[model samples]
Target: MIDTLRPVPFASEMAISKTVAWLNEQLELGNERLLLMDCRPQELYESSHIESAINVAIPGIMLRRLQKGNLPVRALFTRGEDRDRFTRRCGTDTVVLYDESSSDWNENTGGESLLGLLLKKLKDEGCRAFYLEGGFSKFQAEFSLHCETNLDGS
Candidate 1:
Protein backbone atom coordinates (compact mmCIF):
# COMPACT_ATOMS: atom_id res chain seq x y z
CA MET A 1 0.00 0.00 0.00
CA ILE A 2 2.87 2.34 0.75
CA ASP A 3 4.78 3.13 -2.43
CA THR A 4 7.22 6.02 -2.77
CA LEU A 5 10.86 5.63 -3.79
CA ARG A 6 13.55 8.08 -4.87
CA PRO A 7 16.93 7.96 -6.53
CA VAL A 8 19.56 7.27 -3.89
CA PRO A 9 20.62 10.56 -2.35
CA PHE A 10 24.18 11.66 -1.55
CA ALA A 11 25.86 9.74 1.27
CA SER A 12 26.90 12.87 3.14
CA GLU A 13 23.32 13.75 3.99
CA MET A 14 23.00 10.57 5.99
CA ALA A 15 25.66 11.43 8.56
CA ILE A 16 24.90 11.74 12.28
CA SER A 17 26.49 15.06 13.25
CA LYS A 18 23.65 17.19 11.87
CA THR A 19 21.03 14.67 12.92
CA VAL A 20 21.90 15.13 16.57
CA ALA A 21 20.98 18.80 16.34
CA TRP A 22 17.60 17.95 14.83
CA LEU A 23 17.10 15.20 17.39
CA ASN A 24 17.66 17.79 20.10
CA GLU A 25 15.02 19.98 18.53
CA GLN A 26 12.58 17.07 18.46
CA LEU A 27 13.45 16.28 22.06
CA GLU A 28 12.54 19.85 22.89
CA LEU A 29 9.26 19.76 20.97
CA GLY A 30 8.44 16.24 22.26
CA ASN A 31 8.16 14.73 18.75
CA GLU A 32 9.38 11.52 20.29
CA ARG A 33 7.93 9.29 17.62
CA LEU A 34 11.59 8.61 16.97
CA LEU A 35 11.71 5.21 15.38
CA LEU A 36 15.09 4.70 17.01
CA MET A 37 16.16 1.15 16.29
CA ASP A 38 19.11 -0.36 18.09
CA CYS A 39 20.58 -2.91 15.72
CA ARG A 40 22.90 -4.34 18.34
CA PRO A 41 22.73 -7.90 19.60
CA GLN A 42 19.64 -8.74 21.61
CA GLU A 43 21.51 -9.11 24.86
CA LEU A 44 23.42 -5.92 24.15
CA TYR A 45 20.19 -4.04 23.59
CA GLU A 46 18.77 -5.41 26.82
CA SER A 47 21.97 -4.36 28.51
CA SER A 48 22.09 -0.72 27.29
CA HIS A 49 21.25 1.52 24.33
CA ILE A 50 20.01 4.95 23.25
CA GLU A 51 16.84 6.38 24.67
CA SER A 52 13.58 5.51 22.81
CA ALA A 53 15.41 2.86 20.82
CA ILE A 54 14.05 -0.60 20.06
CA ASN A 55 15.98 -3.81 19.42
CA VAL A 56 15.83 -4.94 15.79
CA ALA A 57 18.75 -7.23 15.28
CA ILE A 58 19.52 -10.91 15.77
CA PRO A 59 21.89 -12.86 13.50
CA GLY A 60 19.83 -15.48 11.71
CA ILE A 61 16.65 -13.44 11.59
CA MET A 62 18.34 -10.53 9.86
CA LEU A 63 20.28 -12.96 7.70
CA ARG A 64 17.03 -14.32 6.37
CA ARG A 65 15.75 -10.85 5.69
CA LEU A 66 18.89 -10.10 3.75
CA GLN A 67 18.37 -13.23 1.70
CA LYS A 68 14.81 -12.20 1.04
CA GLY A 69 14.88 -8.58 0.02
CA ASN A 70 11.24 -8.31 -0.99
CA LEU A 71 10.04 -9.51 2.39
CA PRO A 72 7.42 -6.87 3.33
CA VAL A 73 9.86 -5.30 5.81
CA ARG A 74 7.38 -6.07 8.52
CA ALA A 75 8.68 -9.65 8.72
CA LEU A 76 11.53 -8.28 10.80
CA PHE A 77 9.13 -7.42 13.57
CA THR A 78 9.30 -9.83 16.50
CA ARG A 79 5.60 -9.79 17.17
CA GLY A 80 2.43 -10.13 15.11
CA GLU A 81 0.84 -7.11 16.74
CA ASP A 82 3.87 -4.97 16.12
CA ARG A 83 3.89 -6.01 12.50
CA ASP A 84 0.32 -4.82 12.22
CA ARG A 85 0.74 -1.67 14.26
CA PHE A 86 4.00 -0.73 12.59
CA THR A 87 2.34 -0.33 9.20
CA ARG A 88 0.43 2.63 10.52
CA ARG A 89 3.56 4.21 11.94
CA CYS A 90 5.93 3.60 9.01
CA GLY A 91 5.76 6.78 6.96
CA THR A 92 5.02 9.12 9.84
CA ASP A 93 8.27 8.89 11.77
CA THR A 94 11.94 9.43 11.06
CA VAL A 95 14.11 6.32 11.53
CA VAL A 96 17.49 6.12 13.21
CA LEU A 97 19.36 2.80 13.13
CA TYR A 98 22.62 1.97 14.94
CA ASP A 99 24.82 -1.02 15.66
CA GLU A 100 28.12 -1.63 17.47
CA SER A 101 30.89 -0.49 15.08
CA SER A 102 29.04 -0.09 11.82
CA SER A 103 31.11 2.70 10.34
CA ASP A 104 33.25 0.10 8.57
CA TRP A 105 31.62 -0.05 5.17
CA ASN A 106 34.66 -1.31 3.31
CA GLU A 107 34.21 -4.74 4.83
CA ASN A 108 30.52 -5.00 4.02
CA THR A 109 28.42 -5.02 0.88
CA GLY A 110 26.32 -2.00 -0.13
CA GLY A 111 24.14 -2.81 2.85
CA GLU A 112 27.19 -3.31 5.04
CA SER A 113 25.94 -4.09 8.55
CA LEU A 114 22.46 -4.95 9.74
CA LEU A 115 21.69 -1.30 10.35
CA GLY A 116 22.81 -0.51 6.83
CA LEU A 117 20.68 -3.23 5.36
CA LEU A 118 17.71 -1.92 7.29
CA LEU A 119 18.40 1.52 5.87
CA LYS A 120 18.23 0.21 2.34
CA LYS A 121 15.01 -1.58 3.16
CA LEU A 122 13.45 1.55 4.60
CA LYS A 123 14.60 3.51 1.60
CA ASP A 124 12.92 1.13 -0.78
CA GLU A 125 9.70 1.41 1.17
CA GLY A 126 9.65 5.19 0.78
CA CYS A 127 10.68 5.92 4.35
CA ARG A 128 13.20 8.36 5.84
CA ALA A 129 16.25 6.86 7.60
CA PHE A 130 19.32 8.31 9.30
CA TYR A 131 22.59 6.58 10.00
CA LEU A 132 24.31 6.94 13.36
CA GLU A 133 27.73 7.30 11.61
CA GLY A 134 30.16 5.95 14.22
CA GLY A 135 27.63 3.59 15.80
CA PHE A 136 26.72 3.32 19.47
CA SER A 137 30.25 3.27 20.81
CA LYS A 138 31.17 6.64 19.36
CA PHE A 139 27.73 7.96 20.11
CA GLN A 140 27.87 7.12 23.80
CA ALA A 141 31.48 8.18 23.95
CA GLU A 142 30.38 11.71 23.14
CA PHE A 143 26.69 11.93 24.03
CA SER A 144 26.51 9.54 26.94
CA LEU A 145 23.48 11.35 28.23
CA HIS A 146 21.57 10.11 25.19
CA CYS A 147 22.12 6.53 26.25
CA GLU A 148 20.04 4.56 28.72
CA THR A 149 21.67 1.78 30.71
CA ASN A 150 19.48 -1.18 31.46
CA LEU A 151 22.25 -3.27 33.04
CA ASP A 152 24.86 -2.15 35.52
CA GLY A 153 28.20 -1.33 33.88
CA SER A 154 30.18 -4.53 33.57
Candidate 2:
Protein backbone atom coordinates (compact mmCIF):
# COMPACT_ATOMS: atom_id res chain seq x y z
CA MET A 1 0.00 0.00 0.00
CA ILE A 2 1.15 3.53 -0.75
CA ASP A 3 1.76 6.06 1.99
CA THR A 4 -0.62 8.89 1.10
CA LEU A 5 0.77 11.26 3.69
CA ARG A 6 4.27 11.26 2.21
CA PRO A 7 4.95 14.71 0.84
CA VAL A 8 5.87 14.74 -2.79
CA PRO A 9 8.69 17.05 -3.83
CA PHE A 10 6.68 20.11 -4.93
CA ALA A 11 7.51 22.32 -7.87
CA SER A 12 7.30 26.10 -7.83
CA GLU A 13 3.87 27.59 -7.11
CA MET A 14 4.38 29.92 -10.09
CA ALA A 15 4.99 27.08 -12.52
CA ILE A 16 1.59 27.49 -14.16
CA SER A 17 2.64 25.89 -17.43
CA LYS A 18 3.86 22.72 -15.81
CA THR A 19 0.84 22.57 -13.56
CA VAL A 20 -1.61 22.96 -16.43
CA ALA A 21 0.07 20.21 -18.43
CA TRP A 22 -0.12 17.80 -15.55
CA LEU A 23 -3.73 18.68 -14.74
CA ASN A 24 -4.85 18.35 -18.35
CA GLU A 25 -3.21 14.99 -18.73
CA GLN A 26 -4.68 13.65 -15.52
CA LEU A 27 -8.16 14.90 -16.42
CA GLU A 28 -8.10 13.92 -20.07
CA LEU A 29 -7.08 10.37 -19.32
CA GLY A 30 -9.23 10.15 -16.19
CA ASN A 31 -6.14 9.05 -14.31
CA GLU A 32 -7.88 9.19 -10.91
CA ARG A 33 -4.47 10.30 -9.75
CA LEU A 34 -5.68 13.41 -7.99
CA LEU A 35 -8.79 15.06 -6.57
CA LEU A 36 -9.16 18.53 -8.06
CA MET A 37 -10.67 21.02 -5.64
CA ASP A 38 -11.92 24.47 -6.66
CA CYS A 39 -11.76 26.68 -3.60
CA ARG A 40 -13.82 29.44 -5.12
CA PRO A 41 -17.38 30.57 -4.68
CA GLN A 42 -19.94 28.54 -6.60
CA GLU A 43 -20.93 31.49 -8.74
CA LEU A 44 -17.39 32.28 -9.76
CA TYR A 45 -16.51 28.64 -10.14
CA GLU A 46 -19.48 27.95 -12.37
CA SER A 47 -18.39 30.87 -14.55
CA SER A 48 -15.15 29.11 -15.40
CA HIS A 49 -12.91 26.53 -13.76
CA ILE A 50 -10.96 23.49 -14.81
CA GLU A 51 -12.92 20.56 -16.14
CA SER A 52 -14.04 18.07 -13.49
CA ALA A 53 -12.95 20.41 -10.68
CA ILE A 54 -15.03 19.86 -7.58
CA ASN A 55 -16.34 22.98 -5.87
CA VAL A 56 -15.76 23.22 -2.13
CA ALA A 57 -16.69 26.48 -0.47
CA ILE A 58 -14.28 27.40 2.33
CA PRO A 59 -15.79 30.60 3.59
CA GLY A 60 -14.96 32.25 6.91
CA ILE A 61 -18.10 30.83 8.48
CA MET A 62 -16.66 27.36 8.14
CA LEU A 63 -13.36 28.38 9.74
CA ARG A 64 -12.31 29.35 13.21
CA ARG A 65 -10.54 32.63 13.79
CA LEU A 66 -7.20 32.55 15.56
CA GLN A 67 -5.24 35.41 17.08
CA LYS A 68 -1.45 35.48 17.33
CA GLY A 69 0.10 38.66 18.66
CA ASN A 70 -2.24 41.04 16.82
CA LEU A 71 -2.15 38.84 13.71
CA PRO A 72 -4.25 35.92 12.63
CA VAL A 73 -2.23 32.78 12.05
CA ARG A 74 -4.73 30.94 9.86
CA ALA A 75 -8.16 29.40 9.71
CA LEU A 76 -9.40 26.00 8.58
CA PHE A 77 -12.74 24.61 7.56
CA THR A 78 -14.15 21.73 9.49
CA ARG A 79 -13.91 18.54 7.51
CA GLY A 80 -17.24 16.86 6.82
CA GLU A 81 -18.14 13.31 6.00
CA ASP A 82 -18.82 14.24 2.39
CA ARG A 83 -15.40 15.76 2.08
CA ASP A 84 -13.86 12.67 3.62
CA ARG A 85 -15.73 10.44 1.22
CA PHE A 86 -14.57 12.45 -1.76
CA THR A 87 -10.99 12.37 -0.58
CA ARG A 88 -11.10 8.65 -0.02
CA ARG A 89 -12.69 8.01 -3.38
CA CYS A 90 -10.16 10.19 -5.15
CA GLY A 91 -7.24 8.60 -3.33
CA THR A 92 -5.69 10.52 -0.47
CA ASP A 93 -2.32 10.69 -2.16
CA THR A 94 -3.07 13.60 -4.47
CA VAL A 95 -5.49 16.39 -3.63
CA VAL A 96 -4.93 19.17 -6.13
CA LEU A 97 -6.35 22.43 -4.83
CA TYR A 98 -6.89 25.47 -7.03
CA ASP A 99 -8.12 28.98 -6.32
CA GLU A 100 -8.13 31.95 -8.68
CA SER A 101 -7.49 34.28 -5.76
CA SER A 102 -3.83 33.36 -5.77
CA SER A 103 -3.47 35.96 -8.50
CA ASP A 104 -5.22 38.68 -6.53
CA TRP A 105 -3.75 40.05 -3.30
CA ASN A 106 -7.05 40.98 -1.61
CA GLU A 107 -8.42 37.53 -2.37
CA ASN A 108 -6.40 35.77 0.31
CA THR A 109 -5.83 38.35 3.05
CA GLY A 110 -4.59 35.74 5.54
CA GLY A 111 -0.91 34.83 5.89
CA GLU A 112 -1.12 31.53 4.03
CA SER A 113 -3.21 30.83 0.96
CA LEU A 114 -6.46 28.91 1.28
CA LEU A 115 -4.97 26.09 -0.71
CA GLY A 116 -2.01 26.04 1.67
CA LEU A 117 -4.25 25.67 4.70
CA LEU A 118 -6.31 22.94 3.07
CA LEU A 119 -3.19 21.08 2.09
CA LYS A 120 -1.87 21.36 5.65
CA LYS A 121 -5.03 19.84 7.04
CA LEU A 122 -4.98 17.11 4.44
CA LYS A 123 -1.42 16.31 5.38
CA ASP A 124 -2.35 16.22 9.06
CA GLU A 125 -5.05 13.73 8.15
CA GLY A 126 -2.37 11.51 6.59
CA CYS A 127 -3.10 12.56 3.03
CA ARG A 128 -0.89 14.07 0.39
CA ALA A 129 -2.17 17.35 -1.09
CA PHE A 130 -0.87 19.66 -3.79
CA TYR A 131 -1.59 23.28 -4.70
CA LEU A 132 -2.11 24.48 -8.21
CA GLU A 133 0.33 27.18 -9.20
CA GLY A 134 -1.48 30.52 -9.60
CA GLY A 135 -4.81 28.68 -9.37
CA PHE A 136 -7.49 28.35 -12.06
CA SER A 137 -6.75 31.67 -13.70
CA LYS A 138 -3.25 30.57 -14.55
CA PHE A 139 -4.48 27.22 -15.75
CA GLN A 140 -7.04 28.80 -18.07
CA ALA A 141 -4.54 31.34 -19.29
CA GLU A 142 -1.95 28.74 -20.09
CA PHE A 143 -4.34 26.19 -21.55
CA SER A 144 -6.36 28.74 -23.55
CA LEU A 145 -9.49 26.82 -22.71
CA HIS A 146 -12.85 27.88 -21.33
CA CYS A 147 -15.44 25.71 -19.64
CA GLU A 148 -18.69 26.92 -21.11
CA THR A 149 -21.41 24.38 -20.96
CA ASN A 150 -25.09 24.56 -20.04
CA LEU A 151 -27.14 21.58 -19.01
CA ASP A 152 -30.00 22.53 -21.28
CA GLY A 153 -29.39 25.05 -23.99
CA SER A 154 -32.57 26.36 -25.54
Candidate 3:
Protein backbone atom coordinates (compact mmCIF):
# COMPACT_ATOMS: atom_id res chain seq x y z
CA MET A 1 0.00 0.00 0.00
CA ILE A 2 2.96 2.32 0.52
CA ASP A 3 3.43 2.48 -3.24
CA THR A 4 4.64 6.04 -3.57
CA LEU A 5 6.75 6.30 -0.43
CA ARG A 6 9.83 8.42 -0.71
CA PRO A 7 12.87 6.19 -0.45
CA VAL A 8 14.17 7.82 2.69
CA PRO A 9 17.59 6.21 2.86
CA PHE A 10 19.18 9.08 4.76
CA ALA A 11 16.49 10.48 6.98
CA SER A 12 19.17 12.88 8.21
CA GLU A 13 18.64 14.82 5.02
CA MET A 14 17.43 18.38 5.54
CA ALA A 15 13.79 17.68 4.86
CA ILE A 16 11.81 14.84 3.27
CA SER A 17 10.12 17.31 0.96
CA LYS A 18 6.34 17.53 0.96
CA THR A 19 6.51 18.25 -2.73
CA VAL A 20 3.55 16.15 -3.94
CA ALA A 21 3.81 13.96 -0.81
CA TRP A 22 2.28 12.94 2.43
CA LEU A 23 4.23 12.20 5.30
CA ASN A 24 1.25 14.54 5.65
CA GLU A 25 -1.28 13.20 3.17
CA GLN A 26 -1.44 9.45 3.77
CA LEU A 27 -1.02 9.59 7.60
CA GLU A 28 -4.14 11.69 8.22
CA LEU A 29 -6.32 8.79 7.05
CA GLY A 30 -4.59 5.93 9.00
CA ASN A 31 -4.03 3.88 5.89
CA GLU A 32 -2.59 0.37 6.13
CA ARG A 33 0.96 1.22 5.23
CA LEU A 34 2.22 3.75 7.74
CA LEU A 35 2.60 4.03 11.51
CA LEU A 36 4.24 7.07 13.02
CA MET A 37 5.70 7.28 16.50
CA ASP A 38 6.72 10.66 17.74
CA CYS A 39 9.63 9.73 19.98
CA ARG A 40 9.77 13.02 21.80
CA PRO A 41 8.75 13.35 25.46
CA GLN A 42 5.11 13.70 26.59
CA GLU A 43 5.66 17.32 27.51
CA LEU A 44 7.20 18.14 24.16
CA TYR A 45 4.97 15.91 22.09
CA GLU A 46 1.86 17.20 23.78
CA SER A 47 2.76 20.72 22.81
CA SER A 48 2.86 19.83 19.11
CA HIS A 49 3.18 16.79 16.93
CA ILE A 50 2.00 15.48 13.58
CA GLU A 51 -1.62 14.76 12.66
CA SER A 52 -1.43 11.01 13.01
CA ALA A 53 1.06 10.07 15.71
CA ILE A 54 1.50 7.88 18.74
CA ASN A 55 3.43 9.41 21.57
CA VAL A 56 5.94 6.71 22.38
CA ALA A 57 7.31 8.92 25.13
CA ILE A 58 4.53 7.79 27.41
CA PRO A 59 4.80 4.54 29.35
CA GLY A 60 3.04 1.20 28.97
CA ILE A 61 2.52 -1.34 31.66
CA MET A 62 1.93 -4.94 30.58
CA LEU A 63 2.36 -7.43 33.32
CA ARG A 64 1.63 -11.20 33.55
CA ARG A 65 1.10 -11.52 29.79
CA LEU A 66 4.64 -12.35 28.83
CA GLN A 67 4.57 -16.13 28.95
CA LYS A 68 3.14 -18.24 26.12
CA GLY A 69 2.83 -15.28 23.88
CA ASN A 70 3.62 -14.43 20.30
CA LEU A 71 2.55 -10.86 19.86
CA PRO A 72 3.86 -7.97 17.84
CA VAL A 73 5.01 -5.07 20.04
CA ARG A 74 2.18 -3.04 18.60
CA ALA A 75 -0.22 -5.77 19.61
CA LEU A 76 0.38 -5.19 23.30
CA PHE A 77 -1.55 -1.94 23.15
CA THR A 78 -4.54 -3.70 21.67
CA ARG A 79 -5.14 -5.80 24.79
CA GLY A 80 -6.64 -2.85 26.60
CA GLU A 81 -8.42 0.50 26.32
CA ASP A 82 -5.26 1.36 24.46
CA ARG A 83 -5.40 5.00 23.65
CA ASP A 84 -7.21 4.59 20.31
CA ARG A 85 -4.15 3.26 18.49
CA PHE A 86 -4.05 0.75 15.65
CA THR A 87 -2.42 -2.03 13.55
CA ARG A 88 0.85 -3.79 12.73
CA ARG A 89 3.22 -4.39 9.84
CA CYS A 90 3.37 -7.39 7.55
CA GLY A 91 6.83 -6.83 5.99
CA THR A 92 5.80 -3.92 3.77
CA ASP A 93 4.24 -1.87 6.53
CA THR A 94 6.82 0.71 7.52
CA VAL A 95 7.39 2.29 10.91
CA VAL A 96 8.50 5.89 10.96
CA LEU A 97 9.94 7.33 14.18
CA TYR A 98 10.66 10.93 15.16
CA ASP A 99 12.14 13.04 17.98
CA GLU A 100 12.89 16.73 18.58
CA SER A 101 16.47 16.79 17.26
CA SER A 102 18.89 14.43 15.60
CA SER A 103 21.02 12.10 17.70
CA ASP A 104 24.07 13.23 19.74
CA TRP A 105 25.37 16.56 20.93
CA ASN A 106 28.30 18.13 22.84
CA GLU A 107 30.56 16.02 25.06
CA ASN A 108 28.18 14.49 27.59
CA THR A 109 25.08 13.99 25.49
CA GLY A 110 26.30 12.22 22.39
CA GLY A 111 24.10 9.49 20.97
CA GLU A 112 21.18 10.55 23.13
CA SER A 113 18.43 10.70 20.58
CA LEU A 114 15.23 8.98 21.68
CA LEU A 115 14.50 7.93 18.11
CA GLY A 116 17.65 5.86 18.29
CA LEU A 117 16.33 4.14 21.37
CA LEU A 118 12.93 3.70 19.74
CA LEU A 119 14.52 2.10 16.73
CA LYS A 120 16.59 -0.18 18.91
CA LYS A 121 13.56 -1.47 20.75
CA LEU A 122 11.57 -1.64 17.55
CA LYS A 123 14.27 -3.68 15.84
CA ASP A 124 13.43 -6.49 18.24
CA GLU A 125 9.88 -6.45 16.87
CA GLY A 126 10.79 -6.36 13.17
CA CYS A 127 9.33 -3.93 10.63
CA ARG A 128 10.63 -1.82 7.80
CA ALA A 129 11.59 1.57 9.25
CA PHE A 130 12.82 5.12 8.84
CA TYR A 131 14.01 7.85 11.21
CA LEU A 132 12.41 11.29 10.95
CA GLU A 133 15.70 13.05 10.54
CA GLY A 134 16.20 16.30 12.40
CA GLY A 135 13.07 15.06 14.15
CA PHE A 136 10.30 17.50 15.11
CA SER A 137 12.47 20.54 15.23
CA LYS A 138 13.34 20.23 11.60
CA PHE A 139 9.97 19.00 10.49
CA GLN A 140 8.24 21.88 12.22
CA ALA A 141 10.63 24.31 10.65
CA GLU A 142 9.74 23.15 7.18
CA PHE A 143 6.25 21.78 7.55
CA SER A 144 4.83 23.79 10.42
CA LEU A 145 1.44 23.76 8.78
CA HIS A 146 1.33 19.99 9.04
CA CYS A 147 1.83 19.85 12.81
CA GLU A 148 -0.86 19.29 15.47
CA THR A 149 -0.08 21.67 18.35
CA ASN A 150 -2.91 20.04 20.32
CA LEU A 151 -1.46 19.56 23.83
CA ASP A 152 -3.13 16.20 23.78
CA GLY A 153 -0.61 13.52 24.62
CA SER A 154 -2.74 11.93 27.28
Rate residue 99 of model 1 by lDDT: 28
Model 1, position 101, has a per-residue lDDT of 26
Compose the digit string of candidate 3's lDDT tens values, residues 1-154: 2443436532223222211125444544454545554333442343234433454432321111111122223332323322234233323354553322222111112233442343444444665444332234444454332233433222
Q: Rank order by TM-score, top first?
A: 1, 2, 3
- TM-scores for all predictions: 0.43, 0.42, 0.38
lDDT of 2 by residue, 56-130 (tens): 444431221110112122212234632653565465235544333332112343435643555566666755554
* Poorest stretch of ten by lDDT in candidate 2: 64-73
CA RMSD per model (angstroms)? 9.6, 9.4, 11.3
- Segments in model 3 whose C-alpha atoms lie over 4 Å from true places: 1-24, 39-51, 58-92, 102-126, 133-146, 152-154
Candidate 2 Cα errors over 4 Å, as ranges: 1-20, 39-52, 58-82, 90-93, 103-116, 125-128, 133-154
* Top candidate when judged by lDDT against the true structure: 1
In terms of lDDT, the poorest run of 10 residues in model 1 is 1-10
| Cα lDDT of model 1 by residue, 80-120, tens digit | 43334335446654555432223312224355544356456
Model 1 scores a TM of 0.43
